Design a protein around this ligand. Structure first.
Ligand SMILES: [Mg+2]
Ligand SMILES: [Zn+2]
Lengths: 225, 104, 136, 468, 52
RNA sequence: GGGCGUGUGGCGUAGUCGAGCGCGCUCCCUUAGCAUGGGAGAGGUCUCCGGUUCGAUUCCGGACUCGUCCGCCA
RNA sequence: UCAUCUAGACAGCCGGACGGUGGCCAUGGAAGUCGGAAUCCGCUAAGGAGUGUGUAACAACUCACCGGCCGAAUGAACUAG
């Protein structure tokens, strides 16, 4: 399933949510339908944490997540950090990042094995990503889009990239990430695919205005069947 | 009477508040499955003006297409067709009164 | 703001009246935006309609590309440079006035934002938070 | 509250899936619950749940299902609510719901029906004939998430008795077949999904997913019931004759080869049963379509279609055995298609591909389908060369190379010619020498145990030390 | 659909009235003059406009 | 703003209730040039929309459009 | 100014509200009720060649007329303080 969901009318689910294999994060100011989608589809096996990052309802663009670790900005308060430490399982590691770009979901596009980052990140932050997430890192842009997290949706099975992407960039990124990539649109043609939707190994959640060919492209590239 | 049966059928489908295109698809499927009441109907339905159209045999294999209002009886639709006949005759008489002075 | 607001906004000290020229932060090829109107502003005799951070305004491109000049379009203020107070009581300000171009529904005409944006704007507009590099 | 009469339905007198006097059908236009029955429901709450299920929007449908489930969960208080009237209405709606695009709708509907059976056991007997086939179709749905929970629940409903589950397949087999016929023959893509709200594609995609489930069910039915072919021959023929099952065998377009694979399994099962041999026309139609599929595989889609290729070749080998390679004879250009298929297939190798190729050779050699020297060898040689250059760069390469060697070695044995022997030695040396790290992968070296006499290999080691 | 008898009972209070042409007052169906002072108890009344 | 009139072919313009000519150019022929002329061409929703009539450019009503004329203060 | 009125008036209930005759023209039909004319008898306590609803035309319902209950004034149109 690519599950049709709105955040109070918003068809961008990746902005307000962060979904990994092991956990899920949702914003505190959410509707009953928005919570019920993650509660029904994810089930009781996977914890869902209602969280606020840096005083903001936006959490997907603020944080970058992995099954092994979670990265939070510097502006995240101690109460939010302690609540995430209690609510999250003991396996994941939560570490604050002290870096100027500070919006880790926009900066970092990552999965379990390999990650794409903004080219201009600091070397200490790159080593921190490689340490906490245990993930090999490449500094690359998707056809000149420096915000790889906003302009790519990535999982273990496959990836969706920006629609206006050069084909040569598509095989280059596909060989670099060792996963097949498809250029496509989400939410009735919105270009920002990573902000448009969240995905993991068995679930994808998207906006209600995402059309049927777009949803078919999603389930084909992410192998959710 | 068979026109009244067709009208009762279409009105029963209308009174279920069913979508008009789904009603037309139901007519097509029952025509494919050989329902006589469905096969008497012509598919471009004018439900916006509450009007259907029905095929009647000219000889008791050629068929004619006649429009029937759903809000009037079949006999009342026949009287309307008779009325359009009667109005046409009076215009023809007016033309016959016109002809001599007009052509002069 | 008005239609495309995702939630409400606390009152930010108004810093951009009508006639203000702010930098154009996105990559749409426009250089500055000239504010002619503020969405949702009230009516008072002689009072100029002023804008704050996170507000949607009506603006014209005074300097930039000729297909963007000489027409009115909606814009969103992302940097204010007039100091305002949050409910945790820090007084903060950027060093320039800056906004981005959008449609009336709020999605950006451009694709990337240079420089910081305010969290009071990023929370209120998700597309701005999507294309934003750093949110403070 | 509910108004109108289904007058058109009365004339038809076809109950489709239903055997209790209510038409149950997959198509959106018909099989909708009759207004009069809907009014007859015991409580107002139930009636509202039914209106919501009728509405198109999913959030509304889901909310209604959630409510219905809650009512069923509190069975003791609500037992009066669920009556024959409820069951007749549910049966009509359930059919439409199981074909729903949204998985949650599908899963919830299945869960609800199972709960009803457990709670109302022995009173749903009248309705078991309607409900059981549909429940099973869900348990044989390609998506794992819908199928696995549904099966687990069904087993639990029957007190975890394997025999009962098997019995169900036997008892309602005629009905199960009727469901398959209805999806395959009676339905069309348009009938299943509304045109206004769907594109030409998607409608096709949906039909294909549903039909695939039907085929999987058919395969299961055949395995479970030994005598199914004899008792239901007429029904089986109509389902098989229709091209809809066969249209699934297209690799040019489509998200997955999983559906295509299911069709291949059906053809194989039918051959094992002997139904395909028994009925020539069905077999010929299937065979020709399979040959066409071989052409569809192309360089652009080779990566996508690679897992299915070993299976395709294996089926072909089995079919060839029938009628002394009669399958090739059916199509004039079949040999050309095979040659083309082989050329495209060799470029990308998948695990088990080589064994399939050898199996095809083994079946074909008696009837001389491929020239051993002019045609086959070139295929083999090119293959090793390709394998070496991209070697051992991929993971399972060790297994793939091992396979090539085992297979090629067998092929070579049936030559009695110098060129083949020469090729084997030269290629082996090249494969080991350019290599990569063949020795280093112990498993690779073990799997590729040897290619020549032991003493000579030692002499070559001697040359390497002796070399400049 | 409500019910035929229940539609009759609800329409007895909602639809089977008369309307004064001068002051738009909702009046009894068998009334002869408007009960309001502002129109001067006029006898210009019309039936309330039904559907269908 | 109002009043008063107005509206025809690609262009110009004639019409009593029973759409025509010229020009432009469609073609062909004509010719010592300082290249003409002849014969057949097409062409309108009569500004538009209603009503009367049997039919309205032709009568009338409405709308549209253009041209005119007359108009604020200290 | 017209009418009705203890020989039973006007409101309210209840019952009948009929035959010649589907009166004559005209219509594919129109039988009281699309129209054109005439508009008369019988039985009556009383019932129109019809007041509406009403159907293709019927059928059906209701009327204005007469009757039981009521027992005494009432209805229409108009004028002006
Ligand atoms: Mg002023
Ligand atoms: Zn009044």
């Amino acid at each position: 399933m690519a599950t049709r969901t709105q955040f109070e009318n918003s068809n961008e689910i990746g902005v307000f949510s962060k979904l990994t294999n092991t956990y899920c994060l949702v914003a505190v100011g959410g509707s009953e339908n928005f919570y019920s989608a993650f509660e029904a589809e994810l089930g009781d096996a996977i914890p869902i944490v209602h969280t606020t990052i840096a005083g903001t309802r936006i959490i997907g663009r603020m944080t970058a997540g992995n099954r092994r670790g979670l990265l939070v900005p510097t502006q995240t308060t101690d109460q939010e950090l302690q609540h995430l430490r209690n609510s999250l399982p003991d396996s994941v590691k939560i570490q604050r990042v002290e870096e100027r770009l500070s919006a880790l979901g926009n900066v970092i596009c990552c999965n379990d094995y390999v990650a794409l980052v903004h080219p201009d990140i600091d070397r200490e932050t790159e080593e921190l990503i490689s340490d906490v997430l245990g993930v090999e890192v490449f500094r690359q842009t998707i056809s000149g889009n420096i915000l790889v997290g906003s302009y790519c949706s990535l999982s273990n099975q496959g990836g969706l990239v920006h629609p206006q992407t050069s084909v040569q960039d598509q095989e280059e990124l596909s060989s670099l990430l060792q996963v097949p990539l498809v250029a496509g649109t989400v939410n009735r043609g919105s270009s920002v695919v990573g902000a448009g939707m969240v995905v993991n190994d068995y679930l994808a959640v998207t906006g209600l205005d995402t059309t049927a060919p777009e949803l078919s492209v999603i389930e084909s590239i992410f192998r959710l069947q | 009477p068979l026109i009244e049966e067709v009208k009762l059928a279409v009105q029963g489908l209308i009174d279920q508040q069913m979508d008009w295109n789904t009603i037309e698809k139901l007519i097509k499927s029952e025509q494919k499955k050989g329902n006589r009441i469905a096969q008497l109907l012509n598919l471009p339905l004018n439900l916006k003006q509450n009007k259907i159209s029905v095929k009647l045999d000219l000889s008791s294999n050629e068929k004619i297409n006649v429009t029937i209002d759903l809000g009037l009886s079949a006999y009342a639709n026949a009287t309307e067709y008779f009325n359009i006949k009667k109005t046409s005759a009076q215009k023809q008489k007016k033309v016959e009164k016109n002809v001599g002075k007009a052509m002069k | 703001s008005g239609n495309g607001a995702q939630g409400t906004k606390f009152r930010i000290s108004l810093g951009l009246p009508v006639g203000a020229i702010m930098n154009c932060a996105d990559n749409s090829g426009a250089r500055n935006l000239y504010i002619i109107a503020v969405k949702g502003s009230g009516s008072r005799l002689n009072r100029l309609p002023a804008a704050s951070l996170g507000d949607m305004v009506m603006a014209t491109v005074k300097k930039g590309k000729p297909e963007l000049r000489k027409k009115v379009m909606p814009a969103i203020v992302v940097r204010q440079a007039k100091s305002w107070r949050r409910r945790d009581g820090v007084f903060l300000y950027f060093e320039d006035n800056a906004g981005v171009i959008a449609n009336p529904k709020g999605e950006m005409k451009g694709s990337a934002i240079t420089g910081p944006v305010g969290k009071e704007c990023a929370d209120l507009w998700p597309r701005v938070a999507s294309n934003s590099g750093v949110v403070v | 509250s509910f108004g109108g009469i289904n007058t058109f339905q009365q004339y038809n007198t076809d109950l489709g899936l239903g055997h209790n006097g209510v038409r149950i059908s997959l198509n959106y236009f018909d099989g909708l619950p009759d207004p009069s029955l809907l009014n007859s429901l015991y409580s107002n709450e139930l009636k509202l749940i039914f209106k919501s299920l009728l509405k198109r929007d999913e959030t509304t449908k889901e909310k209604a299902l959630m409510d219905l489930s809650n009512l069923i969960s509190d069975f003791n208080q609500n037992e009066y609510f669920f009556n024959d009237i409820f069951l007749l209405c549910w049966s009509q709606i359930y059919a439409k719901l199981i074909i729903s695009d949204y998985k949650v709708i599908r899963l919830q509907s299945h869960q609800i029906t199972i709960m009803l059976v457990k709670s109302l056991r022995k009173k749903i007997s009248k309705f078991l004939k309607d409900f059981i086939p549909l429940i099973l179709l869900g348990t044989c749905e390609l998506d794992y998430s819908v199928s696995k929970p549904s099966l687990n629940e069904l087993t639990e409903c029957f007190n975890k008795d394997p025999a009962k589950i098997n019995a169900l397949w036997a008892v309602f087999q005629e009905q199960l077949l009727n469901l398959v016929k209805e999806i395959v023959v009676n339905e069309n893509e348009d009938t299943i999904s509304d045109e206004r709200y769907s594109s030409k594609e998607e409608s096709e995609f949906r039909y294909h997913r549903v039909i695939a489930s039907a085929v999987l069910l058919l395969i299961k039915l055949f395995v479970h019931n030994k005598d199914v072919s004899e008792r239901n021959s007429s029904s089986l023929k109509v389902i098989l004759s229709d091209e809809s099952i066969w249209k699934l065998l297209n690799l040019k377009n489509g998200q997955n080869t999983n559906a295509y694979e299911t069709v291949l399994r059906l053809i194989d099962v039918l051959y094992t049963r002997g139904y395909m041999p028994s009925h020539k026309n069905i077999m010929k139609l299937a065979v020709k379509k399979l040959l066409k599929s071989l052409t569809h595989i192309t360089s652009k889609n080779i990566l996508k279609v690679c897992p299915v290729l070993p299976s395709i070749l294996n089926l072909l080998a089995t079919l060839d055995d029938y009628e002394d390679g009669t399958i090739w004879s059916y199509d004039k250009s079949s040999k050309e298609k095979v040659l083309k298929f082989l050329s495209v297939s060799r470029t990308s190798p998948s695990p088990g591909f080589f064994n399939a190729v050898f199996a095809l050779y083994s079946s074909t050699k008696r009837h001389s389908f491929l020239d051993y020297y002019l045609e086959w060898l070139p295929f083999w040689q090119k293959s090793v060369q390709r394998l070496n250059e991209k070697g051992f760069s991929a993971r399972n390469s060790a297994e793939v190379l091992n396979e090539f060697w085992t297979n090629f070695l067998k092929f070579a044995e049936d030559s009695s010619e110098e060129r083949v022997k020469k090729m084997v030695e030269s290629e082996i040396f090249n494969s080991l020498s350019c290599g990569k790290s063949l020795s280093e992968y112990t498993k690779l070296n073990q799997t590729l145990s040897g290619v020549f006499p032991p003493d000579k290999w030692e002499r070559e080691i001697e040359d390497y030390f002796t070399s400049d | 659909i409500i019910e035929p008898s229940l539609k009759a009972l609800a329409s007895k209070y909602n639809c089977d009235k008369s309307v004064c042409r001068k002051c738009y007052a909702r009046l009894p169906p068998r009334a002869t003059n408007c009960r309001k002072r502002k129109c001067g108890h006029t006898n210009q009344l019309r039936p309330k406009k039904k559907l269908k």
